[PDB]
Amino acid sequence: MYGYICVDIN
Amino acid sequence: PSVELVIDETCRVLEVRPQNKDGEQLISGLELLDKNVEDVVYELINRSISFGFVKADDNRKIVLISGALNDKRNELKTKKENDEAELTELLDNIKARVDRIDNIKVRTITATSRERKDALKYGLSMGKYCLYLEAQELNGSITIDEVHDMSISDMIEKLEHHHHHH
Structure with missing residues (x-):
């Protein structure tokens, strides 16, 4: 289990 | 457009889930x-x-x-x-x-x-x-509701155009 990537496109 | 991608050791996205409602409509029907x-x-x-x-x-x-x-x-x-x-x-x-x-x-x-x-x-x-958190340190005049609709680009200038000085 590595991580979480929270993206926010602008 | 806030979306959270949970990744495995092999860098693959296990689940695509929304953080904010804007990301939810965006990821509707996305495999x-x-x-x-x-x-x-x-x-x-x-x-x-x-x-x-x-x-x-x-x-x-x-x-x-x-x-x-x-x-x-x-x-x-x-x-x-x-x-x-x-x-x-x-x-x-x-x-x-x-x-x-x-x-x-x-x-x-x-x-x-x-x-x-x-x-x-x-x-x-x-x-x-994180930048909202820092912006409340550098000012505190930023609400969490506006952060939902604003741009992260606009958040950068919220942090740089800091007004915790009067």
Whole structure:
């Protein structure tokens, strides 16, 4: 289990 | 457009889940599961242009790729720095991957288990929670509601045009 990537496109 | 992509050791997105409602309409009908996070974010940005949530050519658009090291990874704190370093490089690869889209300039923020737990409750991405957190230190005049609709680009100027001085 590595991580979480929270993206926010602008 | 706040979306959380849970990744496996092999960098593949296990689940695509929304952090904010804007990301929810964006990911409606998106099969991006079991694919590498690099392509997942690339298609995601381009679809944000297609839905018309954000302007592709008009503004200097900052696209945020934030990532946090998971809570289960943080069971022990032995060489958690190493995992953060590799996470920083993982994000740096995403950054270089997705910056190939027209007028997309990327910021990458590594976060901890705190920013992610709070971000999912506040309804944002980890980095947009993080710069909001810092903006309340540098000013405090920023509300969490506006953060849902505002640009992360506008959040950068909220932090730089800091007014905790009178």
